[PDB]
Write a protein that binds this ligand. Structure first.
Ligand SMILES: O=P(O)(O)O[C@H]1[C@H](OP(=O)(O)O)[C@@H](OP(=O)(O)O)[C@H](OP(=O)(O)O)[C@@H](OP(=O)(O)O)[C@H]1OP(=O)(O)O
Ligand SMILES: [Cl-]
Ligand SMILES: [Zn+2]
Length: 187
DNA sequence: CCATCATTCGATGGG
């Protein structure tokens, strides 16, 4: 029902250009005997609650906003689900975000998590430890390529019929990030 | 409250 402005998608998911915000598009699928049935009702997008020192508020990261909304998803404890995130920045360690996602996965063994990041959040000096902790908790940690960007455009954006138009350098940036993520996950 | 930055889950500066 709720779709993202095209300008907001192309300004926030560009994998060579940073913004001072995080968007997270999410999709939930049920895993059956062999198959997976797509649950169109369980998809949407959100962004971080911005830091706001006028109120003494040091923000709430997009990943923790997703954990906040999990109860409202009303996932049946008797079924197994795969959650996919398409997140403009990779999850941080230093605010405790990777830790809470790990705790979530340990507490909810019927939920399998897949994360595709557009960009690596290395402003956090412990960014490697975040990506390794999520992998160690059983999350698939990946870089967004053309296929994931095009899927997010097609699925989450208010395109009004406009096909995905890849930005210059999309493939080159995806490959370079893919190489940085592989070196981090080798250990 | 915006505007800027060729913008790292905002920091500044101007009014
Ligand atoms: O079932 P297929 O023959 O592979 O059709 C695919 C498939 O459609 P769905 O998204 O409806 O399943 C792609 O998604 P995947 O299942 O392969 O992940 C989709 O890509 P988007 O998710 O990017 O929209 C793609 O694109 P489109 O619907 O734009 O044609 C479409 O067709 P093609 O792969 O033949 O282009
Ligand atoms: Cl985070
Ligand atoms: Zn965080």
């Amino acid at each position: 029902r709720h779709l993202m402005d095209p300008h907001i998608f192309t300004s926030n998911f560009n994998n060579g250009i940073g913004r001072h915000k995080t968007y997270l598009c999410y999709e939930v699928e049920r895993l059956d005997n062999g198959t997976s049935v797509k649950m169109d009702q369980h998809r949407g997008f959100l962004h971080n609650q911005a830091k706001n020192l006028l109120c003494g508020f040091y923000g709430r990261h997009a990943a923790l906003r997703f954990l906040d909304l999990v109860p409202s998803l009303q996932l049946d404890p008797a079924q197994i689900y795969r959650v996919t995130w398409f997140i403009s920045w990779s999850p941080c360690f230093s605010w405790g975000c990777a830790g809470e996602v790990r705790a979530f996965l340990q507490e909810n063994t019927h939920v399998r998590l897949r994360i595709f990041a557009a960009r690596i959040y290395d402003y956090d000096p412990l960014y490697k430890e975040a990506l390794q902790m999520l992998r160690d908790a059983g999350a698939q940690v990946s870089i967004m390529t053309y296929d994931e960007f095009k899927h997010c455009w097609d699925t989450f954006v208010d395109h009004q019929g406009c096909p995905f138009q890849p930005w210059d350098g999309l493939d080159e940036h995806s490959q370079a990030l893919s190489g940085r993520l592989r070196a981090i996950l080798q250990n």
